[PDB]
Curated annotation (Swiss-Prot), chain A:
Cellular compartments annotated: Cytoplasm; Nucleus
GO biological process entries: proteasomal ubiquitin-independent protein catabolic process; proteasome assembly; proteasome-mediated ubiquitin-dependent protein catabolic process
Domain of life: Eukaryota
UniProt gene name: PRE4
UniProt keyword annotation of Ribosomal protein present: no
Keyword annotations from UniProtKB, A to Z: Cytoplasm, Nucleus, Proteasome
Family membership noted in the UniProt record: Belongs to the peptidase T1B family.
Name the UniProt record assigns to this protein: Proteasome subunit beta type-7
Swiss-Prot record, chain B:
Assembly with partners or alone: The 26S proteasome consists of a 20S proteasome core and two 19S regulatory subunits. The 20S proteasome core is composed of 28 subunits that are arranged in four stacked rings, resulting in a barrel-shaped structure. The two end rings are each formed by seven alpha subunits, and the two central rings are each formed by seven beta subunits. The catalytic chamber with the active sites is on the inside of the barrel.
Matching InterPro entries: Ntn_hydrolases_N, Proteasome_alpha, Proteasome_alpha-type, Proteasome_asu_N, Proteasome_sua/b
Family per record: Belongs to the peptidase T1A family.
Residue(s) carrying Phosphoserine: 13
Swiss-Prot/TrEMBL keywords: Cytoplasm, Isopeptide bond, Nucleus, Phosphoprotein, Proteasome, Ubl conjugation
Chief place where the protein resides: cytoplasm
Keyword Phosphoprotein: yes
Entry-linked Pfam families: Proteasome, Proteasome_A_N
Cross-link entry Glycyl lysine isopeptide (Lys-Gly) (interchain with G-Cter in ubiquitin), positions: 190
Compartments where located: Cytoplasm; Nucleus
GO biological process: proteasomal ubiquitin-independent protein catabolic process; proteasome-mediated ubiquitin-dependent protein catabolic process
Designated name of the protein: Proteasome subunit alpha type-6
Name of the gene: PRE5
Length: 233, 233
């Protein structure tokens, strides 16, 4: 049993017709201190999988080492390591889910919320979540922490059910994701303006965008607001 | 000579030989014959079951390890039970932890290493059984030959046991032919029964005497015995 120290906030994601999109800002909080700003919380595994992590950063780094090892180990005595026998997003997830549940079962959890996004070898999209309790679930859209409360409602307006997937394009999806990130920047006190976004498309492959920034924010209406009730000036 | 260097597996002879391993290999040669061959869509196992009396049964020689993998044994049956059980567990681990079916090539590496440990340590003994492993994984049909020395090899076809040499030359001849028996299991099996009968001498393969197993593209590893093999005699 422990307590998170340096933490990463929301991780949001959704799937579109040709793949999945996942994003997460670059902040590493220390309580209410916005302590670190160059933290990458999206971990690419191979070229068909990206793992988004929130929660304790020290544990995130541990999961990173684990993922690198998975790649190294899968390459051993594997002549088809970059072909038929490369790591599938589902393998990477089942692995992490296993670890997450074993650790909570030993009363020593990896204090994180994880979302594994990718495209299977047969082209199928992959989006599944696992957290410190070992709980897992899939949905056309998935978000952790604050994003679960504010991103999902927005992302679900694009893909409310399975049949909305084929009707959604990368442009629509990426736009929804970028807007959600802005909303989270407005209301989440542990969020950052800088973030990374990655797309895993069954045709274009893995696109990993770094250093994005929330833009087009509305703040002007603030000038009109004064006092907290009766004040006029 | 030999007598002074064949007391245990931890001793090299003056020429670099390991007699205990070689004596274990001898248990295989004394074992009933079994054959294996594969095309590009299937892999088949044909084995001659041996009986003690005409009042006894014909000891099974094929063990299923998973829905996509199985093997045939020649030599000490108990040692086959042990090794196949270890294989069943490795296949199981792969599915439960990684939601991935174990690659036949990996299964072979695992077996090789398990046998190798009983050839470099004091107190233990080499395994006294040979195994033929067939399976369909993410890279098609496969056939492996396992020797107690720890040597495992991937082939298009092969045979082990007494008089196995007959069937083996036959396959080395029929190669270009059966390797193309794709999409037609009955043919591959017949081609197997023909290879195995090339090692007969005592009697002729009867109904409760022949044992066949197959696995492939859309065929879970299944074992056929008795009436089920009648249509092949």
């Amino acid at each position: 049993t422990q307590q998170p120290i340096v933490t990463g906030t929301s991780v949001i994601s959704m799937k579109y017709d040709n793949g999945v999109i996942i994003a997460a800002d670059n902040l590493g909080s220390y309580g209410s201190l916005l302590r670190f700003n160059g933290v990458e919380r999206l971990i690419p595994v191979g070229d068909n999988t990206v793992v988004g992590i929130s929660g304790d950063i020290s544990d995130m780094q541990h999961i990173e080492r684990l993922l690198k090892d998975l790649v190294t180990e899968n390459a051993y005595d594997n002549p088809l390591a970059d072909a038929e026998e490369a790591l599938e997003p589902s393998y990477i997830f089942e692995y992490l889910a296993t670890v997450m549940y074993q650790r909570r079962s030993k009363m020593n959890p990896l204090w994180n919320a994880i979302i594994v996004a990718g495209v299977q070898s047969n082209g199928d999209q992959f989006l599944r979540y696992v957290n410190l309790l070992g709980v897992t679930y899939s949905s056309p859209t998935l978000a952790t922490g604050f994003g679960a409360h504010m991103a999902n409602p927005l992302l679900r307006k694009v893909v409310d059910r399975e049949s909305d997937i084929p009707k959604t394009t990368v442009q629509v999806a990426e736009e929804a994701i970028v807007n959600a990130m802005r909303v989270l920047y407005y209301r989440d006190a542990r969020s950052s303006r800088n973030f990374s976004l990655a797309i895993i498309d069954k045709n274009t492959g893995l696109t990993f965008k770094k250093n994005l920034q929330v833009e087009n924010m509305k703040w002007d209406f603030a000038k009109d607001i004064k006092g907290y009730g009766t004040q006029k000036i | 000579f030999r007598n002074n260097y064949d007391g245990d597996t931890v001793t090299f002879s003056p020429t670099g030989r390991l007699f205990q391993v070689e004596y274990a290999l001898e248990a295989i040669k004394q074992g009933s014959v079994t054959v294996g061959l594969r095309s590009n869509t299937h892999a088949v196992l044909v084995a001659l079951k041996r009986n003690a009396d005409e009042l006894s049964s014909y000891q099974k020689k094929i063990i299923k390890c998973d829905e996509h993998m199985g093997l045939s044994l020649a030599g000490l049956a108990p040692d086959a039970r042990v090794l196949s059980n270890y294989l069943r567990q490795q296949c199981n681990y792969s599915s439960l932890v990684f939601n991935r079916k174990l690659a036949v090539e990996r299964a072979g590496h695992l077996l090789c290493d398990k046998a190798q440990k009983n050839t470099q340590s004091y107190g233990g003994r080499p395994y006294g059984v040979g195994l033929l492993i067939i399976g369909y994984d993410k890279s098609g049909a496969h056939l492996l030959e396992f020797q107690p020395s720890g040597n495992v090899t991937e082939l298009y076809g092969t045979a082990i046991g007494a008089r196995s040499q007959g069937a083996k030359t036959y396959l080395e001849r029929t190669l270009d032919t059966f390797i193309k028996i794709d999409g037609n299991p009955d043919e591959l099996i017949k081609a197997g029964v023909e290879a195995i009968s090339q090692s007969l001498r005592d009697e002729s393969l009867t109904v409760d005497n022949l044992s066949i197993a197959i696995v492939g593209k859309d065929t879970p590893f299944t074992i056929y015995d008795g009436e089920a093999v009648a249509k092949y005699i």
